[model samples]
Target: TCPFYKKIPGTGFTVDAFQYGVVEGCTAYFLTHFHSDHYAGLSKHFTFPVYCSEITGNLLKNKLHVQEQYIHPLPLDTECIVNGVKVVLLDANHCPGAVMILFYLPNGTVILHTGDFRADPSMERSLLADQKVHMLYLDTTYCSPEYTFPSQQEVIRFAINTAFEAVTLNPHALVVCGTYSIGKEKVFLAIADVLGSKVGMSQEKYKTLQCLNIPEINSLITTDMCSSLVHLLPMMQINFKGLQSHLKKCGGKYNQILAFRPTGWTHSNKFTRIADVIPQTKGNISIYGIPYSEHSSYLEMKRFVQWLKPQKIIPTVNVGTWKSRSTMEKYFREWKLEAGY
Candidate 1:
């Protein structure tokens, strides 16, 4: 049987009181993105009808190879009635299939949940004039003014330049960098676009990219497709030793080797060691310092919060609480009071 409601301290409201048989009954459980933090709890804890964009469902089932029965896919910008809530998925622009969920209640109250979003003008403009939002559950992962990033296109260009330079400088060396299955696919596409050649990608990423409908971008090669200018697989293991061995076996036939780590290599000391393992003699390996952040900058977060004017902005993500809360308190304290239950 599904675990029933458990009240969260200080919130008064019982959480998931209506849940039964491993599924919680809320108006609905809206998935904003495929990121672990957002979707992690759903698979095990709740089996309530899950709502997400079509691409997101495709990625989850086909790319991630998850069970199809768990997903209820919807289209972008289209309104759907789920468990009596009006839900709309908007293009997040951070990742190919990423999305932000807009929840409208019967009471005329609207809640905007931004999973992990950047300050792309296209996304901001898409939602700003279209909806009257009341509460905002924001992705404040990079809400500090001190954190800044270049445009996604600029970062892509940087990655391409780094990949090309590595290959050009060491015609026979394998250049190993780190990236996730999904995000690095874009980097490979950018590289392919620059070099005017078919870019190689892992089987998993290949399957994921296929759903995006951008066939012109993916070469879709196996891990064995080692040669000049071949992008390697998403390393399942965290260490660089296996990658170093693979590069050694390739014997510099490939012009460059590119790997990607999406976690910013910040979680542990292993990333640093792994980065150091690339041989210095075969080819020069550069850690492409291109900032392909999944979160918005401080200014963007502030402006978004200010514009939406949510009753109380709850900083949900890691960096969100630390950076966004103070900013909200300083500029919009009155609204904060109204936000409190």
Candidate 2:
């Protein structure tokens, strides 16, 4: 009976609650993106109406094989009515299909549910900047001060330059990037641009990228492994042992393997600049753990909450334990004090 259980009080709607499976009093289910953690409980037998971005709907059908009848693909930054409530979808800046949802209820309550997002300046120009949001459902994935990393553009540039440098030193070096099903496409895409080569991946991964409907990706990726010097692989395969096995499978086609394991975990408080974010090497296998995150950093969150100044904040992540929840609240308090609201 906890009102905080992914259920929006006074609105029979749940955001990213497919994992809960047929939630009580939930007439509508909203998906932020195609991430498994958000859409875990959904299946072919899923009931109830679902709302999300058009790309996410395609991902649902193509990737997860969810039926089209239950999926409602809403255009980004457009307003529509659902169950007598006004709804708008904004770019979440997390992934290709990710979105931040806005709800205007019949009871005069305005809510902004940021499913999962990396803060950017573009958000400030949206209509949300002018609205008085009553409840802000925040993604507190990295809510602490320790997670203040560089921007996504900076990280992508570093990865591109790093890969370019590696290949320059060893002309026959194979560039492998660790990526998830939907996020971190820009990293490899940039590297591909700098290196002037296509990206190679398994047919399954390529199919998922196709669902995103990104026209640029159409000519940039290939299923044929031997066609491109750069390859996209799962995070587990970006390690020394895994890269060694991969290189062995290459049959001497490449001289050295340069892998990029992009994640926020590699970020350290001791590091001040992007160059200080180091790389690990073992013989022919080199791994650069770049700080590339789909979620907002601590500083980003601070600026976000401070500017919005919502009446109440409902953290959608890191709320399992009281300590974790309170820690987020402490930051909120500080932000509130700073915003003077």
Candidate 3:
């Protein structure tokens, strides 16, 4: 019931359906990433087949439990046609299964939508040399110079090095690190790679690791893998007051023990003193800070805007709801462009 070029009511652009309804005549719909903010309202409303990278599709199916019918999985860097529009998926590098989308309209308009992405040189260089992008839909979560973040690779290295050092200091000590369920597979892989043996994980973590094709490591033991040296128990289970006594009993004999608890400790005030969660013992237990984030930092966002040099910059996801829109505008205005909702 909507016109091809008609903008939706309230929004400036006359485009397809709003919230989750299918637009009658739209050529295609591209999902940049599988974040809840982006895909929460999609399934119920839009019937068009969604296009994304293979990893993203798998993640949506396995992690988020999204339906398979709507997903049209495409490989990274490969161009494919969706409803007559040329579309390509690029690595976002924010999470394991994240992606940025490039759309080539029939009229020759090339739009690059950067889903939450970081300014890792490898990611930037890959996208930079891949194609000449026209319009850029940037991830402006952080658009100020004040916000600084380390690369994901650097974060992984720091966490692994710290864990190894702690192990060296106390061979019979139990070590645990925290991370999120879906995002921190890399940390576990780094641990496995360093240990040169199979690590313990829950059934869910084991399934998740199966999707990762890292040549350096592989999932070793599931519930069967739980042993004295390194045990992969959920953070909640291990952190319980009663469980501490149990772990101390089991861990007393081992020289070094290591486990990862996937959570956002840096962002939460409650986790300010995570070290307290571990028992005070002669065995060395160190808390490592790795600035790993799934969203773009202010400087990365600014660099992305500079690279695209778009005619107009529009804040979509975090617009108006938070101060993110205004913050992004400040940067765009400095570059002399119209930043809008």
Candidate 4:
């Protein structure tokens, strides 16, 4: 069930996953991003040479409370050797510090591990045309054809524009942008910039944004929820009941609460299921699930498969529950055809 470690055959080096048995012998570990599901057993006590991006290292220490000594910020686009294996880090564009790891072994076999990324223009440029990849570790989050949607930039615009349209009638209404604490920084930045007001966040969220040191963003504490025009709410509080309860407690200073969810799940079967259109009003509270997914869509994944043309594909999450090669390969054949390669 663990899609963790991929050992370099003879050497004692591993990538991403740190197992229970191999602690003292495991020399190097590569991390793609700060996603908790990916980093299962990582903590302060886990001591190993962690290689990741500069943005990833900082976020891990702040979120996971990792030790600074073990955390190593791997340089991007630079070739380096570890345990007689050539390695390079490429931008993932999934989140803040996400990176795609490329490994060139001594046998001239190239293993491309896309550590949770969308195959956008940046990733396309990073992946050379003549590159020969033997094995591809793909992020098959939206593996089905039903998941075709618009681009990320367009999705962000959908989120910002939808919020603007909602607040037009209700000027005193609070615009809540549903975002992960670490992820979706751009959505809030655009929303805040359009309204020309400070984005309100909790104490912990405020600390996370303040540490970022981006002068372009202006976020403050939302002690008085009713008085705040725009609020950077967590993913948990993006519900109608949650906003309804909170609005009732606000003493009627704000008349409405509109929410927008930027996620990949918006790619549904219904015809009205448009990407980043108008907000849907349900019992007076509006919510929109824009196609602002970090993962690659079905269309994008097809292009990635055609570009790399790896001999064998190993899905990191699509077959994550597989306990053996038999089950893993079973889904591989299914997704291999579903991905249209």
Ranking by lDDT: 2, 4, 3, 1
Best by lDDT: 2
Which digits, one per residue and each the tens of the lDDT, describe model 4 over residues 243-277?
78767866877878787777656535335434526
lDDT score at residue 65, model 3, on the 0-100 scale: 61
**How many Å off is the CA of 96 in candidate 1?**
2.4
lDDT of 3 by residue, 185-219 (tens): 66765665575546665678767656555454444
By summed lDDT, which 10 consecutive residues of candidate 3 come out lowest?
Answer: 7-16
| Better-scoring candidate (lDDT), 2 or 3 | 2
lDDT of each: 0.55, 0.85, 0.57, 0.71
Give the residue spans of candidate 2 off by over 4 A. 1-5
Taking the tens digit of each residue's C-alpha lDDT, what string does model 1 give over 1-341?
42221222112222223333344234344565665544554443344556677766776666445567767888887788765556777887667677876767676777666767775656657755676776666676765446655555666765667667766666564444455545445655666555544545556655666776555433533334543255545556324455555656666564334554444313232233332333223243333333456667666766666566666465555532445456645645643444442
Candidate 1 structure, TM-score to reference: 0.74
Q: Top TM-score: which candidate number?
A: 2
TM per candidate comes to 0.74, 0.96, 0.73, 0.84
